[PDB]
Structure 1
Amino acid sequence: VKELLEAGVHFGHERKRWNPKFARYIYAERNGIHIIDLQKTMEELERTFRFIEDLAMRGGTILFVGTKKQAQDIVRMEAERAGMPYVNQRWLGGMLTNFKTISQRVHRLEELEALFA
């Protein structure tokens, strides 16, 4: 059921701003706009979710991100819809690499929670 539903409203986008690398996943080009190979997506979808489901049962925590507005809140709801960590709230420098100093901002939010109740 995954297939046609993608063709539902989830393929083809952009034009003349692509990247030759991505070209292998491309199918054609109508109206000047690029048409993505729907059938090939399906394959990558399988391999991906294999890892997704795997790391899920492994109990891993996935970090979701998308500051882009056209996916702003969609990242939000789906996040609590799994308890999985995430940030579409505009990314930051050292989110992961400087996770130490960043997490201190959290420990400060905890303290604010302390006076918030």
Structure 2
Amino acid sequence: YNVSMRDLLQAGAHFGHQTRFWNPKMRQYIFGARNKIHIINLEHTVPALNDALNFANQLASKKNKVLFVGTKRAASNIIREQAQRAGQPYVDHRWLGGMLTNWKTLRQSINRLKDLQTQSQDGTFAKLTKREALERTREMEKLERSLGGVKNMGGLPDALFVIDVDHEAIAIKEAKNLGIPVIGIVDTNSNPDNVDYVIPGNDDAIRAVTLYASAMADAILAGKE
């Protein structure tokens, strides 16, 4: 499930943000600047990505659960589809404040969503009249877009795989608080201090995020033990 380097180049992982938006903590990876934007070399990307894939594969072999976090508009559909393929918990919409550090309260949310979903599955919704049907149905819609991804999830995850560390800094902080390891895609304008497995690469390209999520999901499925 390794990515080689040519696939990374075709995806476009080598691009970064403009030089004036950089974070000086990525000097080791930034390599050079072809234009007014930085170019992240894939020579450091490939091995770190391979270690991340190996770690996730070992976690899947041990049967641990790896949560997926991407909330950008570009990466939302990709994380949704790939996490559905991999059968692991996912967070598509905005990170709720206290999803992990305040899991006890989110549990009740999962429970009443399941309850009202079973109500819709059975005939209680049918005997509920039309206007009651309608506000309970948008109750469905909002709660499902809010926490549908973590509905199967019943405990704290063993790893957190994140698309944009800056865009999802809150999740990284909660993971640091609870001690759970983080694998994340960091870019030139990003802070890598609280990421245990730091893979450097592009984050805006839909090809790049698709490649990353494909590698992650294929490793998780390839656990097979």
Q: TM-score, normalised by structure 2?
A: 0.50
- Residue 23 of structure 1 aligns with which residue? 27
Q: Specify which of 5, 8, 11 is matched with residue 10 of structure 2.
A: 8
- Residue 77 of structure 1 aligns with which residue? 81
Offset from partner CA, 1:67-103 (integer Å, 9 cap, x none): 1111111000001101100101111111100011011
Q: TM-score, normalised by structure 1?
A: 0.94
- Residue 65 of structure 2 aligns with which residue? 61
One-letter amino acid of the counterpart of residue 78, structure 2: I
Alignment identity in percent? 43
Classify the secondary structure of the residue corresponding to 1:30: coil
Distance 1:111 1:71 in 2: 30
One-letter amino acid of the counterpart of residue 25, structure 1: Y
Q: Specify which of 9, 32, 35 is matched with residue 36 of structure 2.
A: 32
Distance 2:83 2:118 in 1: 25
Q: How many pairs align?
A: 117
One-letter amino acid of the counterpart of residue 92, structure 2: N
Runs of 4 or more above 4 Å deviation: none
Tell me the C-alpha RMSD between the 2 structures: 1.1
